Design a protein around this motif. Structure first.
Motif, mmCIF file in Angstrom:
data_model
loop_
_atom_site.group_PDB
_atom_site.id
_atom_site.type_symbol
_atom_site.label_atom_id
_atom_site.label_comp_id
_atom_site.label_asym_id
_atom_site.label_seq_id
_atom_site.Cartn_x
_atom_site.Cartn_y
_atom_site.Cartn_z
ATOM 1 N N UNK A 174 0.820 -1.207 0.000
ATOM 2 C CA UNK A 174 0.000 0.000 0.000
ATOM 3 C C UNK A 174 0.856 1.261 0.000
ATOM 4 N N UNK A 211 3.261 -1.797 -8.553
ATOM 5 C CA UNK A 211 1.965 -1.217 -8.229
ATOM 6 C C UNK A 211 0.997 -1.282 -9.404
ATOM 7 N N UNK A 212 1.496 -1.125 -10.632
ATOM 8 C CA UNK A 212 0.643 -1.183 -11.813
ATOM 9 C C UNK A 212 0.254 -2.602 -12.200
ATOM 10 N N UNK A 213 0.952 -3.615 -11.685
ATOM 11 C CA UNK A 213 0.626 -5.007 -11.963
ATOM 12 C C UNK A 213 0.209 -5.766 -10.710
ATOM 13 N N UNK A 214 0.006 -5.054 -9.591
ATOM 14 C CA UNK A 214 -0.406 -5.611 -8.293
ATOM 15 C C UNK A 214 0.565 -6.682 -7.795
#
Lengths: 262, 1068, 46, 146
Positions: free
Chosen positions: B26, B115-118
């Motif tokens: 997060x 972050x863009x691909x989790x």
């Protein structure tokens, strides 16, 4: 076997980048009376696109530097579709012809060897003599046989020039065994060969099929024609070089985890 | 487990916040999204979540004791400890650089890709420490299977026989043993890719979860390989992603990815060793007879025509010795359909060398359905080193369609690369020249109060400008004191001759007006010299040249006076020819300025009066060709270095990986405010906006970012009592509300008096931010400390593409923040895309060479030379073209001038071909006559085009569109469809206004186009003739249309009078 | 020379055709010399 | 001019909610669609439709990738359905989404109507304070008898 030895061959070919850093050149028994000015980039590109058992061969077509007639610089490497064993290479009869290869002269062929051999191979010398006798563009004192052998933890390269009496003995003999009649140590001769870190070498690949054909010997033919083009050659143990190993499987009550974090 | 089931069904189980496990993820997502930058921002973002509320309400469930709750009632110490732990986890996993001293965290490319691909932090660290550029396809599956997503997946002993059976049937070999979970996950991925049948239900569920994780893992691995530059690793990752998406092997048929193809026909196509390119060349019957299925031949032909396969054409142009411009034209050679391709098709184009291992230029292309069946041209910068390869490879692969990749061999064997650029003339380390160094007291009185000593570059150029009169080429950046050297040259020309005729030519009209306003206060007020500015009227231009001694003009305005230089004696009797900003001769007003310089050099060498030529430009690499083309000497060539400016410029490049221009403009608002707050806190800043309407949005975003933090209204250094007379004169209420907080706005649609008031407020120090449009970059008479150029591009609606900003406008925007006394240095932060960051970094420190592009606009110059009896034959035209900058640029860059060699015979053949093309374009437009294919004779239409400064194509359209029974509605459409109306601005959100204005016009338009500039010019002419209401962006185009509509109507009246028509001439 | 002598399109096409004919003659002479060198190399080993 | 976001934990539940929104709001013309596919396809579906029924993890991935930054001002109704999985695997993702929404409402002053639906569970005051819901007018705690 082609069941578990293919995985070991792919694992050996995956770590082929470490042998390109320590390259060994046989700088002995040189005649010193044209030399090879092939760069190391084309050798690194051709050493990582070959196998440790299947002998991969390729024609070398290059031009001479300006104001230097006693030096040959192979600037083009054409990969013909072939399928050879660990002792010989089944080269096709069709010669590579292109617009980029029409301005350079063919300096012979170079075939990889699975073992470090001090002497020249009689089958490769007979194949070079047959290529010089069949194709009139390949000369006797202008074509060389760079037998880049395999070394433990190294890339042992060694060149070999064709003698005219050796070319006559290779064209006269037709046995494809391990030791044919008429094999002489004066049939081959070592030539000068040095690396180059100034000019890059071009690669030629067939547009219809791939360069590797050892995974399917029925598709490769000695008289089949091919059209070469300026492209990068694929690996020996690639998905496009072995079509039978990929398209062999046959054509729902598990956990259907949908809409995940992807 | 009955207690939890009884508590969940009777409202007795509270929901506990488990956000401590995904707290570094997060924090990385908040750092990539820009919500949290420092430790205080991370603690404020964590305090607004449910985890802080659960720790404050239930500290025993969150692991907090009573002493932690008593010593921290707002849960700030625990939030700071969690933020420090997340920062340490992000720094250990190489996701974000987090300093423990200041607490600031900077999100890197790996954290943004996670972050863009989790992806997790451990998976990102494993992908960073495992992915190698020399990795093969066997190691890629082991690297993807060793991620943190499959860390809990264990190899069961009951599924060992199924794993052993699948290990002998998988196409990708596994190097690990059967007892390893990574090899089991790789075998499961190979079974899911090759559609192999499983036996266990739990093993099938584990394989499905491994595939659902490995899709995002392969996407993140492809993003990391594209960011790292490994071309072969990115190609293998894209092939693995296409195999995971299409659920088929790489050696499978291309029709297997389409759901409309049968399985038996696909198996019959895969059984026969036939390439997919051979099926595209065959018809519907040949593909059916070759696959022994004529009923499925039409479906196979439709699937081949629906498969994505476009044609790529490469055009290389060597601009410099190290970089070249590569134009890739992509033509869709397939049937575009929404059921196959969709609304848009995404492709990845990577241009690399012959080794195919280092991707030199990677980019994306989203071909829409509205722009389908049209070749789009993408321009990129390709670097070139001293070991030049024989040929580069440009591979354009499909991001969604499997086995759809086109390779283009760009040959570099016949590329005529330019030579090495000469070093610039460095400033000597001598004593600076004081104000008493000048001889004339009137020249020193106009610069004594400005500065007591001149610049060191000015002190080095005063020996060749004030003490000499030769042609001086001064290559200096914006802010080095070129205006002082121009004033010294003007004072030397006035001292050498009191009745001299100085002509200062500048391409920008706003810069020419500023130079005229400076000369009215410096030369006309302190020296009482006749300082005038030339206008667009040929009747008053001769009077201004005869009565004025310092004429400030444009090359488009001086081309009408230089074309009649043999007749006008005032133009031939010149004493000084200053050419300001000659480095922009390869862009806008480039060939016109080159033709004006060639005409001035021809008139100076044929009237027995050598005019003192002073070419002041930027630092250019190929300054020797510009000195030889303009007659500048070797000792007078004071071409300085780009880093030789007195104000040091710190250039930063912010690359944002955003394909859309609107998303890149909306995402670069808060980093621009962060850079303005971190670079110049108490200094004025200029924000270069992409468009005029985007400037107010960027100012509102900067005001919202200032009001979001604790520094509310920090951009207003003055009080409201001093701005209350300033805000009362403005018309826009939103602009006055933005200027009340200290963020002024300026655009093309704003008022000139309001823009002057905003410039006076920003120069006095009242406002700290000035959001200026892209058109107001050169026309800005202000100097700030910071220059934030945000998304320097233009969304052209005429081509419907995001074209990049030119080098001249970027240099004018970088040189606008040159404060000699207000600031010690000047920051220039260019926030653009990742693909244009390398070109913007290369064209900033290195000197940009000049490239003559006069071959594309040589028809008007040939018509002006033939109408003035200058180029009467082919040899005279070749001699006129040899004295220009094009002959100097073609002799230094043959491949940039479309030549095949730098030899004399090849250059003579190219000049003869260009002269023949110009003669054919003049004869086809009825503008000139070719006598015996050797002599050129001016016609009536060519003389009418050269007299009123009109093009040959517009004159041909006016001659072929005006009949003997024409009316006003036809003449307005003929004038609107001319070549002068093709330069109308077309941006986004402009088609609806053109559609609404077409229904209220007095004259209807036969099938109007919303993207054509001629229909927009016709709508603007119909709105101006009917006095209808329009917007500011429409009025700014209508004024530029009406500025040339008078000359267009004069040319139409001349063509009507020459054709023998009275009633169409009276109607015109 | 130094001054660019402007020629017609037909004269430039005739000059290009003469240059192409000279290049074809040089290529034929080089092919004949290569054939003679190959015959001399084959005659020295037979 | 307005958008309605529907956070559903299951994909079949999101499809059922999108079908119910399409069948109920058919007279009002509210376009109900599911945000799925790639990033550009999700951005086109967000720009072409108003009602978007998607997963909270996919919404967090689209917010981290930037697919919802251009349409963040039009989203004025966030219906976070089934918040009873706030302790489940969708817990921290929904918590980070709520924290990002609270930061956007506190910084950019974007008034977004947040409607959080949860089951009959204790400690609902912390869930109401985390979702910026009022304890009197916004909090509606119904027992199992409802």
């Amino acid at each position: 076997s082609s069941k578990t030895e293919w995985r070991v061959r792919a694992i050996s070919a995956a770590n082929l980048h470490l042998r390109t850093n320590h390259i060994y050149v046989s700088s002995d028994d040189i005649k010193e009376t044209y030399t090879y000015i092939l760069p190391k980039n084309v050798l690194k590109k051709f050493i990582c696109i070959s196998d440790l058992r299947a002998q991969i061969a390729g024609y070398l077509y290059g031009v001479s530097p300006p104001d230097n007639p006693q030096v040959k610089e192979i600037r083009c490497i054409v990969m013909v579709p072939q399928w050879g064993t660990h002792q010989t290479v089944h080269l096709p009869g069709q010669l590579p012809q292109h617009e980029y290869l029409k301005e350079m002269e063919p300096l012979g062929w170079i075939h990889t060897q699975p073992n470090e051999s001090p002497q020249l191979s009689p089958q490769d010398v007979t194949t070079h003599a047959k290529i010089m006798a069949d194709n009139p563009s390949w000369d006797g004192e202008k074509t060389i046989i760079i037998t880049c052998s395999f070394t433990p933890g190294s890339c042992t390269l060694t060149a070999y020039k064709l003698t005219p009496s050796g070319y006559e003995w290779g064209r006269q003999n037709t046995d494809k065994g391990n030791n044919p009649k008429g094999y002489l140590p004066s049939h081959y001769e070592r030539v000068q060969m040095l690396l180059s870190d100034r000019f890059l070498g071009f690669f030629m690949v067939p547009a219809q099929s791939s360069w590797n054909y050892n995974f399917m010997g029925v598709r490769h033919d000695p008289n089949m024609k091919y059209e070469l083009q300026l492209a990068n050659p694929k690996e020996f143990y690639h998905e496009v070089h072995r079509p039978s190993h990929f398209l062999n499987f046959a054509l729902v009550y598990s956990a259907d985890r949908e809409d995940l974090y992807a | 487990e009955l207690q939890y089931y009884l508590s969940l069904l009777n409202q007795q189980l509270p929901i506990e916040s488990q956000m401590v496990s995904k707290l570094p993820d997060m924090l990385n997502a908040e750092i990539v999204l820009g919500n949290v930058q420092n430790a205080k921002d991370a603690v404020n973002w964590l305090g607004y979540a449910y985890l802080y509320i659960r720790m404050l309400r239930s500290p025993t469930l969150y692991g907090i004791s009573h002493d932690d709750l008593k010593g921290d009632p707002l849960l700030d110490q625990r939030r700071l400890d969690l933020v420090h732990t997340a920062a340490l986890m992000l720094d250990k996993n190489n996701l974000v650089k987090y300093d423990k001293k200041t607490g600031n965290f900077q999100v890197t490319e790996l954290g943004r890709i996670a972050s863009h691909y989790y992806i997790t932090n451990d998976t990102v660290q494993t992908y960073n420490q495992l992915l190698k550029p020399t990795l093969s396809e066997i190691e890629l599956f082991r690297v993807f299977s060793l991620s943190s997503e499959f860390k809990n997946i264990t190899v069961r002993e009951e599924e060992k026989l199924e794993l052993q059976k699948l290990l002998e049937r998988v196409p990708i070999p596994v190097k690990e043993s059967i007892e390893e979970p990574s090899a089991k996950i790789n075998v499961l991925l190979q079974a899911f890719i090759s559609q192999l049948k499983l036996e266990g239900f739990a093993l099938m569920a584990d394989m499905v979860y491994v595939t659902q994780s490995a899709g995002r893992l392969m996407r993140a691995i492809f993003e990391i390989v594209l960011n790292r530059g490994w071309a072969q690793l990115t190609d293998k990752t894209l092939n693995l992603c296409k195999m995971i998406d299409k659920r088929m092997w790489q050696s499978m048929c291309p029709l297997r990815q389409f759901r409309k193809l049968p399985e038996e026909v696909v198996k019959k196509i895969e059984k026969k060793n036939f390439p997919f390119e051979r099926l595209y060349d065959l018809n519907h019957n040949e593909i059916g007879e070759l696959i022994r299925m004529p009923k499925m031949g039409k479906t196979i032909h439709k699937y081949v025509h629906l498969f994505p396969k476009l044609e790529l054409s490469v055009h290389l142009q060597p601009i410099t010795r190290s970089t070249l411009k590569v134009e890739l034209t992509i033509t869709p050679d397939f049937q575009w359909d929404e059921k196959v391709h969709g609304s848009s098709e995404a492709f990845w184009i990577l241009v690399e060398d012959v080794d195919s291992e280092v991707i030199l230029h990677h980019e994306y292309f989203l071909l829409k359905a509205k722009y389908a069946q049209d070749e789009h041209l993408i321009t990129f910068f390709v670097p070139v080193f001293e070991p030049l390869p024989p040929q580069y490879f440009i591979r354009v692969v499909s991001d969604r369609w499997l086995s759809c990749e086109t390779q283009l061999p760009v040959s570099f064997r016949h590329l005529i690369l330019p030579e090495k650029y000469p070093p610039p003339t460095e400033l000597l380390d001598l004593q600076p020249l004081p104000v008493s160094a000048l001889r004339n007291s009137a020249f020193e009185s106009l610069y004594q109060d400005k500065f007591p000593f001149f610049n060191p570059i000015q002190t080095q150029v005063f020996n060749t400008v004030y003490n000499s009169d030769d042609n001086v080429f001064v290559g200096a950046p914006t802010g080095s004191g070129k205006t002082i050297c121009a004033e010294f040259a003007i004072l030397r020309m006035l001292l050498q001759s009191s009745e001299g005729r100085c002509v200062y030519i500048t391409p920008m009209e706003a810069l020419a007006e500023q130079v005229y306003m400076d000369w009215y206060e410096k030369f006309q007020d302190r020296l009482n010299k006749k300082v005038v500015l030339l206008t667009g009227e040929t009747s008053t231009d001769l009077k201004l040249l005869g009565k004025g001694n310092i004429i400030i003009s444009t090359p488009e305005k001086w081309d009408i006076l230089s074309r009649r230089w043999k007749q006008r004696k005032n133009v031939q009797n010149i004493n000084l020819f200053v050419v300001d900003e000659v480095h922009l001769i390869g862009g806008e007003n480039g060939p016109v300025l080159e033709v004006i310089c060639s005409r001035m050099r021809y008139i100076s060498s044929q009237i027995e009066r050598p005019i003192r030529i002073v070419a002041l430009s930027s630092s250019l690499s190929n300054a020797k060709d510009v000195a030889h083309w303009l007659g500048c000497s070797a000792t007078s060539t004071f071409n300085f270095h780009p880093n030789v400016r007195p104000v040091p410029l710190e250039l930063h490049i912010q690359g944002f990986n955003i394909s859309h221009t609107q998303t890149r403009l909306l995402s670069m608002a808060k980093p621009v405010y962060h850079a303005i707050t971190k670079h110049s806190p108490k200094k004025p800043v200029i924000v270069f906006v992409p468009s005029r309407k985007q400037t107010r949005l960027t100012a509102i975003d900067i005001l919202t970012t200032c009001a979001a933090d604790i520094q509310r209204q920090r951009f207003l250094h003055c009080t409201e009592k001093d701005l209350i007379p300033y805000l009362e004169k403005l018309s826009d209420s939103t602009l006055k509300e933005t200027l009340l907080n200290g963020v002024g706005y300026l655009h093309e649609g704003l008022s000139p008096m309001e823009r002057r008031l905003v410039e006076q407020l920003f120069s006095s120090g009242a406002i700290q931010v000035v959001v200026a449009s892209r058109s107001l970059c050169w026309g800005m008479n202000v100097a700030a400390h910071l220059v934030i150029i945000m998304d320097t591009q233009y969304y052209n609606g005429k081509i419907h593409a995001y074209v990049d900003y030119p080098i001249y406008d970027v240099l004018q925007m970088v040189g606008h923040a040159n404060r000699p006394l207000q600031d010690d240095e000047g920051r220039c932060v260019i926030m653009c895309q990742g693909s244009k960051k390398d070109f913007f970094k290369k064209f900033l420190y290195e000197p940009l060479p000049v490239e003559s592009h006069l071959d594309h606009c040589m028809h008007d110059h040939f018509n002006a030379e033939i109408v003035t009896k200058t180029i009467e034959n082919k040899q005279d035209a070749v001699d006129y073209l040899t004295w220009t900058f094009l002959y100097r640029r073609m002799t230094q860059n043959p491949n940039y001038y479309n030549l095949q060699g730098i030899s004399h015979r090849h250059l003579s053949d190219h000049l003869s071909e260009l002269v023949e093309q110009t003669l054919s374009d003049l004869e086809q437009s009825k503008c000139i006559s070719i006598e015996d294919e050797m002599d050129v004779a001016p016609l009536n239409l060519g003389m009418i085009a050269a007299y009123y400064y009109i093009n040959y194509t517009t004159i041909e359209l006016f001659s072929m569109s005006l009949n003997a029974k024409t009316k006003v509605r036809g003449l307005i459409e003929i004038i609107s469809n001319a070549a002068e109306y093709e330069n109308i601005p077309i941006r986004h959100h402009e088609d609806n206004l053109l559609r609404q204005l077409a229904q209220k016009v007095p004259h209807k338009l036969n099938n109007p186009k919303f993207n054509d500039p001629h229909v927009k010019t016709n709508l603007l002419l119909q709105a101006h003739l009917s006095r209808m209401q329009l917007s500011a962006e429409l009025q700014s185009d209508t004024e530029e249309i009406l500025s040339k509509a008078i000359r267009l109507i004069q040319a139409c009246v001349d063509v009507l009078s020459s054709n023998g028509w009275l009633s169409p001439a009276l109607a015109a | 020379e130094a001054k660019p002598k402007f020629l017609s399109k037909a004269e430039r096409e005739a000059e290009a055709l003469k240059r192409r004919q000279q290049e074809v003659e040089e290529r034929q002479r080089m092919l004949e010399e290569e054939r003679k060198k190959r015959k001399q190399f084959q005659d020295l080993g037979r | 001019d307005f958008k309605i976001i529907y956070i559903a934990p299951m994909r079949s539940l999101v499809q059922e909610m999108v079908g119910s929104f399409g069948k109920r709001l058919a007279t009002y013309g509210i376009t109900v669609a599911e945000l799925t596919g790639d990033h550009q396809l999700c951005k086109e579906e967000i720009s072409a439709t108003q009602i978007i029924v998607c997963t909270p993890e996919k919404w967090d991935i689209i917010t981290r990738k930037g697919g919802e930054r251009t349409y963040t001002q039009l989203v004025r109704l966030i219906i976070l359905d089934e918040i009873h999985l706030l302790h489940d695997d969708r817990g921290p993702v929904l918590e980070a989404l709520v924290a990002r929404a609270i930061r956007n409402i506190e910084m950019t002053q974007e008034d977004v109507r947040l409607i959080g639906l949860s089951a009959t569970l204790p400690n609902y005051e912390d869930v109401a304070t985390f979702l910026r819901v009022d304890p009197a007018k916004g909090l509606f705690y119904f027992d199992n008898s409802f």
